[PDB]
Design a protein around this ligand. Sequence first.
Ligand SMILES: Nc1ncnc2c1ncn2[C@@H]1O[C@H](COP(=O)(O)O[C@H]2[C@@H](O)[C@H](n3cnc4c(N)ncnc43)O[C@@H]2CSCC[C@H](N)C(=O)O)[C@@H](O)[C@H]1O
Length: 251
Amino acid sequence: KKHLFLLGGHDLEMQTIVQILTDRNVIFKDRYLQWDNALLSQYEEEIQQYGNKEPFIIYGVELKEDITPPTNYIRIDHHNEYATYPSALEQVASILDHPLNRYQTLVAANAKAYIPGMLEIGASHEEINLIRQEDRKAQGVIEDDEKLAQEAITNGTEKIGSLYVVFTTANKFSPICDRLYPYEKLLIYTPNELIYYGKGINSIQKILKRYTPISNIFWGGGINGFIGTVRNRLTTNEILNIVEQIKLLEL
Ligand SMILES: Nc1ncnc2c1ncn2[C@@H]1O[C@H](COP(=O)(O)O[C@H]2[C@@H](O)[C@H](n3cnc4c(N)ncnc43)O[C@@H]2CSCC[C@H](N)C(=O)O)[C@@H](O)[C@H]1O
C-alpha cells in the first residue's frame, strides 16, 4: 500500500512533517497552507487522481473535510474529537516507522501542549526558546505581529482571578502567549475572534456551544489546551458576550 500525504496549515510541526516526508521519499503535496485555509478542497486535484484508487492510502494531515473524502482517505489530526490524540508529527512518524529525534520530540510536545509539554520532556531554556521562535516563524509571524503583541500586553490586558483577558487587533496570537507565559488561563479576543488557552477548556466549550454551532469551534489538547472560534463567524457582540461568560467562571 502506497502512501499519499496531504498537508494542512503550516507551523513547526507541519514544517517538521515536511522534512521527514521529504527525507523518506513519500508522495506528499504541500500547497503551503495556513491555519485558516487548511481545506481538503485545496487538494481537489490530488483527491481526483488518487481517490478510490486501490494502491494508495491518502493521509490528510489536519485538513477540514469541506468536501467528502474518498474511501481510501485517513484523517490525521489532533483536534476536536481527535483532540486527545498524539500530535500529527507523532502519528505521521508512526505510519512511516520514523524514530523521532530529540528536536522532533520537542516539536511534537510544543504542538500538543505548548511550553508545558516541553518542560515535561526535560526541555532546557534554550531548547524552549528555539522551538517557540521556529514555531512562530513557521506560522508567518513577523515584526508587525510582535509589535501589536507588545501593545496588547501593555495596554489591553487585565487579570480576573487566574485568567488573563487580552483584547487585540492582532492577527496571530502566539506572540502574545509567549510574552505572557507562564499563565494558568489566557483569553485573547478580537472584534470577531477569540481563542482560549489554559485550564478547563471543556467548560469553555459549553459556553461557545450556546452561541455558535460546533462547526465554528476548534480545540486541541487536554485541560491546559486551547479552544477557539473561527474568524468572522461571530459578531462583535457575540464575542463580547462570550468574554463575559468566560470571566464569570472566575467569580
Ligand atoms: N496552552 C497553550 N497556550 C499557548 N499556545 C499553545 C497552547 N497549547 C498549544 N499551543 C500552541 O498552539 C499551536 C497549536 O497548533 P495547531 O494544533 O496546528 O492548532 C492551530 C490550528 O490548527 C487550529 N485551528 C483549527 N481550525 C482553525 C481555523 N479555522 N483558524 C485558525 N486556527 C484553526 O487552532 C490552532 C490555532 S489557534 C489561534 C489562531 C490564531 N488566530 C493565530 O493566528 O495564532 C501550537 O503552535 C502550540 O505550540
